[PDB]
Design a binder for this molecule. Sequence first.
Ligand SMILES: *[PH-](=O)([O-])[O-]
Ligand SMILES: *[PH-](=O)([O-])[O-]
Ligand SMILES: [K+]
Ligand SMILES: [K+]
Ligand SMILES: [K+]
Ligand SMILES: [K+]
Lengths: 850, 850
Amino acid sequence: LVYDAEFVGSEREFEEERETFLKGVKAYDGVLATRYLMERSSSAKNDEELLELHQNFILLTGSYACSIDPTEDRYQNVIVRGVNFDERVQRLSTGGSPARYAIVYRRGWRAIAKALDIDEEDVPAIEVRAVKRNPLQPALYRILVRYGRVDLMPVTVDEVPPEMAGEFERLIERYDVPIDEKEERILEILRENPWTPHDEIARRLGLSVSEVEGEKDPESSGIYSLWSRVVVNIEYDERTAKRHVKRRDRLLEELYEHLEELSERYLRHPLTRRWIVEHKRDIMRRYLEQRIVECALKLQDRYGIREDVALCLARAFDGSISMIATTPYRTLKDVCPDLTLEEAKSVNRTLATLIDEHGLSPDAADELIEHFESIAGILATDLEEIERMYEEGRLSEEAYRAAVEIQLAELTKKEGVGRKTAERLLRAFGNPERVKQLAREFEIEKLASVEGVGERVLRSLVPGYASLISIRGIDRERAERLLKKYGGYSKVREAGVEELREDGLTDAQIRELKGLKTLESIVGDLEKADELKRKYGSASAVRRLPVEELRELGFSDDEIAEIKGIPKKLREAFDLETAAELYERYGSLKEIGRRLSYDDLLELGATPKAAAEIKGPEFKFLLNIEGVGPKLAERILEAVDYDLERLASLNPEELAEKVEGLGEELAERVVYAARERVESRRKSGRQERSEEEWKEWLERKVGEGRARRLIEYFGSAGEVGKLVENAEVSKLLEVPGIGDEAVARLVPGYKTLRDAGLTPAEAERVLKRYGSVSKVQEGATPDELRELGLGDAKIARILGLRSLVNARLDVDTAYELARRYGSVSAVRAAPVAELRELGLSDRAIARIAG
Amino acid sequence: LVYDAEFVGSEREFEEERETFLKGVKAYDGVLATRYLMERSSSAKNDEELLELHQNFILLTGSYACSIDPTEDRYQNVIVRGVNFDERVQRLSTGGSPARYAIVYRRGWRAIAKALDIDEEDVPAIEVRAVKRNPLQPALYRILVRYGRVDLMPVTVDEVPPEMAGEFERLIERYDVPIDEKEERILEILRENPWTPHDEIARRLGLSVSEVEGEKDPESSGIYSLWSRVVVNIEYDERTAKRHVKRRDRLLEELYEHLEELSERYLRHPLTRRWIVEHKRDIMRRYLEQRIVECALKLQDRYGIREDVALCLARAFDGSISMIATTPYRTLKDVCPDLTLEEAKSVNRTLATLIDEHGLSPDAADELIEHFESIAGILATDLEEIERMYEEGRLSEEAYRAAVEIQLAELTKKEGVGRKTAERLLRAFGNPERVKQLAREFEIEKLASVEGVGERVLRSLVPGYASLISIRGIDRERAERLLKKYGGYSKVREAGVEELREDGLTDAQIRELKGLKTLESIVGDLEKADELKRKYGSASAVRRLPVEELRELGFSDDEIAEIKGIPKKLREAFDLETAAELYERYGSLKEIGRRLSYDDLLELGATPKAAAEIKGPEFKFLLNIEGVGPKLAERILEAVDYDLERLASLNPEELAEKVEGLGEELAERVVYAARERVESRRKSGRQERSEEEWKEWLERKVGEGRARRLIEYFGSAGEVGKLVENAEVSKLLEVPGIGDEAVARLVPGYKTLRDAGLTPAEAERVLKRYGSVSKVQEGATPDELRELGLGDAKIARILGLRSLVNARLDVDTAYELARRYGSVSAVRAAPVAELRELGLSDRAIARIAG
DNA sequence: CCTGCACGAAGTAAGCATATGCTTACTTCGTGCAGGCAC
DNA sequence: CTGCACGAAGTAAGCATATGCTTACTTCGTGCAGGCAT
Ligand SMILES: *[PH-](=O)([O-])[O-]
Ligand SMILES: *[PH-](=O)([O-])[O-]
Ligand SMILES: [K+]
Ligand SMILES: [K+]
Ligand SMILES: [K+]
Ligand SMILES: [K+]
């Protein structure tokens, strides 16, 4: 059952043998492909050209087989099906090479291929056992192969001498040599037909096959023995040897070209190398030996086991990985003495988990392995079974405690499940897998009977029970009923409104269940809200729909204006199309008044008063001082950039300077009216919180306890507020009892910066530098944040560039796509040629759009 | 502060007050909706009709408020913002109802609504503080409200007497009540405009608001005191009260009809009650008191806390659930002395996890709560930090050990991570969350530096490292490189073949990575295989493609025949279209020969010999004798249903019975030829394994060790084989050392039945009854399996009906839809009207197709 | 007061990515005639 | 011995479902002028 051989030659000889064997494999692949073409098409079966190609491939396979182990010393310990061929070849008179003597046997190439470390997944098969269509005498062919007679092996069907095929007797007539009567009775049949199978010769002569064949050595009796007696007496020709070697390599490529020609002629498609490998696999899978090799390769790749040890393991377990993983360590050492404990732990995951994660000895682990096969087996076995096995002395203390801990782990890893509660559950239901099954079956009242199984235990165990029990009115029995009827919380949520109403659920309960409180604000009823959530997805996605699609299947235009959040002035100054387009393109009515001109507002259909109110309140203020002029008032606001404060800042003389056509009397009135306005605003902003006000704000933001603890730690509530306004995150975190969830509720934006992966110190630096997180997202640059010590990943997370960077783009180019362009969504729709202009490769653009 | 009130009346009075309050809530909702229309449309702002409707709604809200607590004894302990109004009303001369005295205050309804247990999610708000658009004098309106003067409160704007509004002074002059100088200074301003706000009266009189208003009692000084002095001296009219009570309900319904009329006139859509409730929520949630109500409701529903305790917790913590979940138990007991430990554990999940899952005292849990806020906080904190906190005496022994165990749990729950390795990881990287972060960043060499982090640890920790390291050639460094470059195993798999080749990956490695070994057998190269996998998905979808779409963008017709697995006979007897259609309609060539007629094969283009070979081998056998008749041989096979065994069973006279034209001498010759075949079938199929053969088969299927264990437990290998052939699963599982993974490898089909959730006993019963699982899927019926004791869910799992039953269909109807339509996939495409014919509802059909 | 409306933040919950349970050709395996071509 | 067609399913690749992890994706909280209006 074992195929093995060891290479002892040099590196140069190693490469020589590897190339020779690979070329022989290519030749035998040509043989098999010619056979496939012969049988695949009935027309190709008759073609003589294909038969010559097949015979040429046979000859080249034999020639390459003769060139393996030429010096007869590169291989040792050649084993084929348990038979050690080193000893069998040693006991022969002429000796020879054990490798070539192995290749003439069925599947003998497996040992030599393992000796050369040739990839066995591609099936490097080399067989020289052709009979019916062999252009030579089969026994003579095999003898020439095993004796390495690359000089006598022809490389072309035309070069085939008749003295080797039809007139095979003429080769014995050149050397005579002693002929036995038993061998004469074999030859008297071979003179009739030289291609007679050996079983046919044995069956027609009354003797067995081994007698007719004999040993491949002159000192024996048989056709092999006769050919060995003849071949050994033939002088080694050197010119023919090298001439054949140089020509056969190009001949193989020529034969492959012919094969592709015939394949395109009979199949209209070529026979690629990969297809030939797969067909070799298919033709060989009838024998278990390929599954053994595949299993050994999987053990080498996935688990890093040595080649010989993995190969021996695959034999001893029929190439079943799932079976080796359930075999105890002592049996593995018995079948493979060279196996290491670490290799066994790598292949047997249960053995590793027992020895390492639980500190058991190999024997203590083998106990549980034998009695329960796997960790899943332990999880399937009832606890009382293991207790009985332990108390009865059939299970050691170590193995018992380890198994009980393994069982308890599967339940304690859930929130609310203590050790006593897990033990009580195992008592009531045997094993944890039973508890999993009962939880998936929503057997809520069954589990609630066990002492210690509270609300949190059920919510952690029963998938979806939490979401249903939290709704008012839905009790435990009703939640179990719904989960069993519909089959999980997902199917309860996907259920129709009418059938949920038939179950007795209140409209409020269905609103809370299906999450339709947002949509039931837009539409008056539940059914259409549920239909909208079904068809379009989320309420937000409905808001993003165009005005026309919203008008279709919609109730009112005012509903469309309320959905998109259109202001009163903007909704009454234009039609729905233009108003919604302006709002979703500029965002704020103030932005409409600031970035668009007064004439542009009128052109779109705005009343002069409506167009003036769409303009900022600065416009309505300026026109009210004896009508400065709607055209000029804009340029007044265009200078100070729509800021009433900057209008009062500069000298009235400088105001008549910057803006064209202005009267100084008018210029003085606007500055005097601007200084009058800034005095009115301070009335509402004259409050900074007092001590009691800061105390109450603290009791609101962090609760009574932490508020007065902070008040005691620092000076007073005023000092705490001073620390807050300056974003002193570190100074607040010092106080014992104050953590992130309290600081983040004091310092706006702290939570967001922490979620981005920033340390409190980095978040403090960013908040101090930029003031707020929104200003970080709009204003901050990647280099600016890199000066503050942030990493590129943190920058990408905090700026919102995660989508772009996830598509294999550096943070700098993603920020450039935000700087030169606009939003991430807009980059996904940009033209490909513009991105190619910017300097991005084609793969990067494909990933951007993908 | 506190809003609270207790109901002490009877059930009848309880329902009376509930209905009165709900109708008042509807009236105030009408007020708010009329206010909304005034601002929503500029045209509705000018409409006097909308103003009339608004004032009518105000009058009705006032009228319903007067009917609350009529006997002035249903409510006690009325608290509004901490102020206990029971004692304040007790200390007044006229006494009165504390409920009505609370409602006349802003937000005073909150106490009465809690007293009546009215749903607070719908915002049952009742405010009687209108001024500018009040059709009555505001102070007189409020005084009428607080004294329950439903007789004097008008129900229509027309019924408003001028002596109560414009000429309000004429009502005080009717009774001559004593007036102090300050009240004269108030009346001299109210004579200018009776709707002047009280703040303006205070601004023009120099006094504060509380001075101008005074106490709502005759024995005081203020406008409230004056109106109280006047109203008390008015006799209570009963007839007007009764008439208002009778009319106001239909008046409210009429006003709602008017509101819908005006809304459809100005907005083209009606204002439903649900929209009104949601708008009340949106408009009202701006005050922190509403967030308190939401927090209290979520604490009552999700966590089962008592109403008063949840309200007090929401008050003391600004209605932030997240802050309460991080507040220690002692602070919660400080703010809520009546809170129970179980309630605190239910709201603070970390406190529960500490007390229950870890057995800490409340103080020991509060230690970790204050120092680390949450369990995730403990997981984020470095281990050395907690050790320092413990050594400094700032952290008790119990809390320290609990925190260390919490940290170690997050790492030990992964395969290969012991306790020593988890401790070493916490040493090297501080906290487990940092280890998670390093694993997600694919910092493989960084984690591998820690002692005890082996291959299994990395594969369990680094997402995707397992899939890449298991491929031959890909080492640790290359896997880390790839994961860092592309950003996860998903993006490495989605990468292009060319860029993977640029990384140095062999074609074999890319084939193994992208799972294209199946497709590279069809197509010669990797690029086209990857393109096919991209557009079409899986090789299965490519095999199912029609012949034309495969021919388009396809290579060869022989390739198409090889893709669909078309037999040689079927591919050479017809064209691609008809052969592929026959194969995809019948599956097997034998089925083709059985269900199609000999003439039908010839009509499609089959040679008579080719058509006979497409027919079963039984057909070719019959033709080989005295030519039974290609036409007749079919009818011979139609009798025994293409079975050679039944042909030799019955007497040739019964053979002449079923067939029309038969010669009796011929009838015996075919039966003798049938008996001739049964001798040939038994010659090669009489093999049952001997003892050594059973021993070797066991050594193959369960390995040498388990084989000899089975051999020793039972008699011999023969008995084991006898148990196997009879599927004696339980008796095989008896043997110590034999588990499920060995039986499933001994008894074919055991694994599949176990995966369906079946007990070994149930799997044994099914295997004994039906022989194999394939025969279960085709032959078995739901009632037959229910006779074997299986549940309906197990039946659905084993038959393959999971998809149908998951769509809320019983197993019986799903099996009927598998019987009538063939396969499950075919049920998804059946016509809707046919499903309605079968008896299925429309929702069921929508779920079937969905 | 009343609340639209404009903005910032993470509250919250919707996607995205990863892990987990399960169904069945998605792939390997066993057998049986048929005789093409061997012990 | 190979061919090669067929059925079966401890076998394993997809498929479906549940869960964890980020963000703004979606609700929520707040503050500011001015009309609903103390
Ligand atoms: P056979 O393989 O012994 O000749
Ligand atoms: P409000 O009650 O007039 O100030
Ligand atoms: K409940
Ligand atoms: K701290
Ligand atoms: K490797
Ligand atoms: K056992």
